[PDB]
Structure formats: C-alpha cells, structure tokens
Design a protein around this ligand. Sequence first.
Ligand SMILES: NC(=O)c1ccc(NC(=O)[C@@H]2CCCO2)cc1
Ligand SMILES: NC(=O)c1ccc(NC(=O)[C@@H]2CCCO2)cc1
Ligand SMILES: NC(=O)c1ccc(NC(=O)[C@@H]2CCCO2)cc1
Ligand SMILES: NC(=O)c1ccc(NC(=O)[C@@H]2CCCO2)cc1
Ligand SMILES: [Zn+2]
Ligand SMILES: [Zn+2]
Lengths: 360, 360
Amino acid sequence: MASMERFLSVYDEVQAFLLDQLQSKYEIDPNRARYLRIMMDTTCLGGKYFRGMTVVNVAEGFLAVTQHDEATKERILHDACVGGWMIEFLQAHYLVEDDIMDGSVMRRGKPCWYRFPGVTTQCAINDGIILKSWTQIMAWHYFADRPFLKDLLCLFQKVDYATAVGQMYDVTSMCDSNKLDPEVAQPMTTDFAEFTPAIYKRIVKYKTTFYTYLLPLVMGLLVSEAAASVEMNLVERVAHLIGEYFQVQDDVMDCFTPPEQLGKVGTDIEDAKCSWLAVTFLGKANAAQVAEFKANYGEKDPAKVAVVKRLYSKANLQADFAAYEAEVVREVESLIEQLKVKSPTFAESVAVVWEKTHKR
Amino acid sequence: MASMERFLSVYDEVQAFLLDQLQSKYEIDPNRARYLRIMMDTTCLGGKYFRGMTVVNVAEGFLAVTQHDEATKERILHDACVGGWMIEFLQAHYLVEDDIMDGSVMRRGKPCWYRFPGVTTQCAINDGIILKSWTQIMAWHYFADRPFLKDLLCLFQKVDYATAVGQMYDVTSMCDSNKLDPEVAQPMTTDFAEFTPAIYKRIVKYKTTFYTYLLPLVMGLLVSEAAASVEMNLVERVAHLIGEYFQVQDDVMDCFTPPEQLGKVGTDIEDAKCSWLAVTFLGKANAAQVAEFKANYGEKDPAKVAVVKRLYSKANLQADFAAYEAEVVREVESLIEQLKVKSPTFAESVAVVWEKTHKR
Ligand SMILES: NC(=O)c1ccc(NC(=O)[C@@H]2CCCO2)cc1
Ligand SMILES: NC(=O)c1ccc(NC(=O)[C@@H]2CCCO2)cc1
Ligand SMILES: NC(=O)c1ccc(NC(=O)[C@@H]2CCCO2)cc1
Ligand SMILES: NC(=O)c1ccc(NC(=O)[C@@H]2CCCO2)cc1
Ligand SMILES: [Zn+2]
Ligand SMILES: [Zn+2]
C-alpha cells in the first residue's frame, strides 16, 4: 500500500461518510446528494495533492522511528489521510470562491465550478461554503476522541483566518492604502509605491503559505503527537520562506508559461497584481522604464500587456530570480539544519517538501 | 445595566479585540483595519438582535435561580454576550453571501454590502468569509479555558452546516429534483409537484431554524452550564416549530408588506420561491386556478406577478394562516409545558421567545 493509494482510498471513505450523513441526519434526497458528490469530486480532485500528502509524509517519517502496535500505525496513517483531506477541501473552498471573486474561466482542463451550466454563482458560493464546513465535519467525526482535536481545530481555524486576510491583501494590492474606503470606488494606484518586496511578502505569506506549507507540516506533527519534537518558530520560518519561494515561481509562471501548459490564461498584468515581476522590475528600472510601466500596467488591452511583457524581458528579471533562489536555498538549508537539533526526522520531511518545491 | 446595554458594550470590546489582533499578529495596516471596521459595523449592526439577545436572556433566567459569586455572574453574562455576538456575526456572514448569491439590492435602509462602491463582489465574498472566521476567533479567545468550549464549537459547527444545507434546499426549490445536474442548466419546474408542506418544512427547518432558534437557545444553556436542566429533543422540537412559524410570517410579508415598510422590495414570486403562500395556494386551488398559477409564476413581468398576487387574494390564504397559527400555538404551548417538568426557568425563556415571534 503506497501512501497515495491509501490517501485516495480514504477520500472514498470520507465522501461516503459525508453523503450518508446528509441522508440520515439532513433529510437529503438522492439528486441533491448526487449534485454534492459531483461538486466534491470536481473541486477536490486533481493534481499531485502536495498539501494532503505532506501530512501523510510527515506522519510516515515519525512512524519509521517510533514504536507502535500495528493497529496504532494504521490509525495514525488514517488520521494523517483525513487531516490531509481536510487541507485539500480547504483548498477547494478557496479555489471555488476565488474563482468566483476574480471572474476566472478555467481550472484544471475544466470550467471553473461556478461556470458549470447547472451550477451558477448563486449555488457555487454556497457550495464553497459547504466545502469548508465539510472540513469541520470530518475533524469532529474522525478526531472526536483524539488528544490533538483541540490543537488541530485551533490551528485550522487560525490558518483559515490568515488565508482570508491574505485574500484581502491580494485583492486590494493594486489600490493605494490611503484611498481604501467602502464608500468610494477604488482607483488603481498611479504611483505603484506599494509594489515593494515587503508588501509583496505580506500578501504571499497570508494568502498562500499558512495553508499550503505551515498547515500540512503542523497537522503531520499533531496527528503523530510529535509537536514537542520541534521548535515551532522554526517550523513557521521555514514554512513561510518555502511558501514565498513557491509563490514567486507561480508569479513568474502566470506571465511566462503558455496557457494550455499552465491550465488557465494568466491575467496578473491586466489585473494589476502586485506580482514578483512587477515589484522586482520596479526595483531596478530607470526613470523612462518606470514611466513606460505606468502607461501600460493593469490594462486588458493586449498591446499594453505586451509592452509590460517586453519591459520585463529587457530588465533581465531572470538574474534577480536566480539570485533570490540562491538566497532562499541558503536560508532553507540553514533552517533544516536547525530543525535537526531537535528532530532529524522532521527535518528530513521538510527537506522533501523543499525538494518538491525547488526542483519542480 | 440593561441587558441590551451590556450586549452593545461587548460589541465594542470584541471589535477592539479583533482589530487590535489584526494589527499585532496579522500585519494589518490602518486603512485595511478601518475597511474591516466599517464592514463589521455595516453587516453586524441593526434591528433588535433577537438572536444574540436570546443567549443573554436564557443566561439571565438561570442567573436568577442559581447561586454564584458576583464575579461569576459577570463572567456568565459576558460569555452570553460574546456567544450572542458569535450568532449575530454568523447572521452577518449569511446575509452578505446570500445577498450576493440572490442579486439583492437593499438591506436595512442601505445598499447590500457588495453594492457599496468601494466593496464590489470581489471583496464582499471574502468579507463574508471573514465574518464567519471572526466567530471562531471570538470563541477560541473568550472561551479558551471554559468547560463548554468543545460543546459550543461542535454545536456552532453543526448549526452552520445545517444552515448551508438549507441554503442549497432554498436555491434549488424551484427546480425538479430529478433534473438537478451540474452539467445542465436548470429549468424552473412546470408541475410544481415539489411545492408541498413537507418540502417547504425541510427548506425552512435547515435554512433558518437551526441558527435563529436552536443555536441561541442551546448557547444560552451552554454558557450557563445548564444543558442537563433540559431534554434536548424538546429543545429541538420547539426551536424548529417556532422557527417555521417565524418563516411563514416572513414568507407572507415578502409578498404583502409594502417595500419601504419591509426594507427590501420582495421577489419570492418572480424568483419562483417555494413560499408558504404558493404551497398553501396549491393545496386548495381548483384546476383552472392551478393552470393560471403555472402560466404566471416565476416571471419578472409585473403583470404576471400581479396575477399570482390576485389568485392568492381570491384563495383566502388568511384562513389557512389563522388555522396554521392556531395549531402552532397548541403545539408550542404543549412543548413549553413539557419543558417545565425539568426546567421552569428555561421553559419561561422559551415562552418569551415565542411571545417575541408570535405577537410580533
Ligand atoms: N474546475 C473547478 O472549478 C476546480 C478545479 C480544480 C480545483 N481544485 C484543485 O485543483 C485542487 C486540487 C484538489 C483540491 O484543489 C477546484 C475547482
Ligand atoms: N519600487 C516601487 O514600487 C516604486 C518606487 C519608485 C517609483 N517611482 C519613481 O521612482 C519615480 C519618482 C517619482 C515618480 O516616479 C515607483 C514605484
Ligand atoms: N447593508 C448590508 O449589506 C447589511 C445590512 C444588514 C445586515 N445584517 C442585519 O440586518 C442583521 C442584524 C445584525 C446581524 O445581521 C447585513 C448586511
Ligand atoms: N400541491 C402541489 O404542489 C401540487 C399538486 C398538484 C398539482 N397539479 C395538479 O393538481 C394538476 C393535475 C395534473 C396537472 O396539474 C400541482 C402542484
Ligand atoms: Zn484571487
Ligand atoms: Zn437566498
């Protein structure tokens, strides 16, 4: 039994639990059960499952070094799978709602869930709500008698909140802070003064890193009852750093990876996003180049999108990416070394996370 | 110190806690804090606060009969206020998202939050997410060391999920069940076969009654450590029944209360909602009347809305409302009598809830 095979098997089991519960306790009818099954599948499956499988991988590294009865090892792996699904369903929730919020068209060779003919925004907003409620139902059912229930729910809660805060930072990142005002329609910045490395960092740290790196790592510790094998400030530092590095590749790919090759036509430029490319370009451009950027950024007009795309090529942003990458490698290695002091095993799992981020 | 005065004072305190936490732990800037303060105010204030004040009222009925130190009485009232705010913020969350989902224009003498100029749907979806995350932050902070933390979070979780399920039942109530299919755009029913008292009941029970009646009642018990003063199956039965009766008045008002007098132009007819009026009309109409209903319902065309409005008047729906009301009075009195066996005090609080629903 490979890890992935176990993880996918547990999806069937959770799906059955949730659907059967809807029938026995929520008076659901079969057609609505079927609608929700389809919703779940469509939104929760696809890709590599780095997030969920990280929880499994962390727990398996502790299983290798820790004495347990076989039935305990099974229970720990089952808990890691359920906790990894809780993170995948949280990712579903985000994606569903973010797609609606941003007017996205495609995700994973498919219409964004809201664009399905028999879905609509009216239903999809609520479907995304359901996705996140399911995470809670899973935790309370599978982890009812577990000693880590409280800590897990508290952590999940804090990660979710960070993530929502991050979405707000992301969707407001093209406005001037001093002009945010519910009463006044928001103009795009003209100075780009808030396109800085520190503001960019704040966006990415909240929007992505808590749920993509910190949560899978700490959930793997909690289901292993191993949170005292580690210095949590180290776990936070390394998660946030790897997560930022991940998002700097994403930002670079939103612009430069061909559309079918990426699965979604990129719109960061036309959305005036505070991307790594824009911030880094503004960090090195001359006066005439800054003025040229201001004249073209944040416009749906493809010819102006192409101008921004050109200034990024003239500016040799690959040099800055390589230099950033080399610093993140130093720093991530340093963190891993510090994590070995208390736990070689957990340090190794972090090393695997990093390899999966970097080499990919 | 009146109860309402205490309840409103605690809003200031929670608001300060949440905003200060955003600054000290989430790197928020002042303008974004201000945006979120405004959001909170706009979405969480207004009206009578029946839901939040029910928690306070239930706890005050137990305080009257239970021996405690003064500092305990204060702590219990403070917990009841915080728990009542958790319910008001859950109501905020619903309203924000439901308004977006349904394309509503007005709420409480104001544009629906999403329609504010500097809000937009792109931000308001996430703002509604934040509203519900705040409920959790409040519980974990104010109730950290409380014996009822677990039970409260579990109850809140189950109520939230019921409510989301209910929204799905509501938004799909004009489709035929056998034709729900994410792949196929959903036609309005032509037979109206699912406009029955039992299907109507299922909608209202999930969509409204768990969060509006069951949650405030059980939260008042939990913060009072009094959940063994009561037979919970009775609390459920009475909550669901009063809640349904509430929603049958709402349904009647969506059609018949003038727009400024109601605060929002009603659209149940044009939305083809499974309302009490439609179900009850179909329950007594003759053949020609049913055919006339089918020809006019669920159309934005005001002249057809007026036809439906006319058939409802010809059909003397007030007779059915009075008869329904008289049965609910019997049944609610019966429940209250049964609740007195274990708790006169809690039975009285239920009697007040009922008076506030019925007489109003
Ligand atoms: N077409 C869609 O609306 C849609 C496609 C994919 C996702 N999610 C994912 O890609 C990751 C992988 C599993 C968890 O979320 C969500 C929605
Ligand atoms: N790094 C940045 O995000 C940033 C820094 C400076 C500028 N603009 C200028 O350097 C000139 C001087 C006045 C007008 O534009 C814009 C952005
Ligand atoms: N204009 C709006 O968008 C808006 C107005 C009112 C509400 N909420 C309420 O009326 C109840 C009362 C407090 C909790 O929810 C939400 C939004
Ligand atoms: N109570 C209902 O919701 C309901 C029951 C019956 C009908 N239609 C009919 O009675 C005739 C007989 C065949 C065509 O229409 C519609 C609705
Ligand atoms: Zn987005
Ligand atoms: Zn609605």
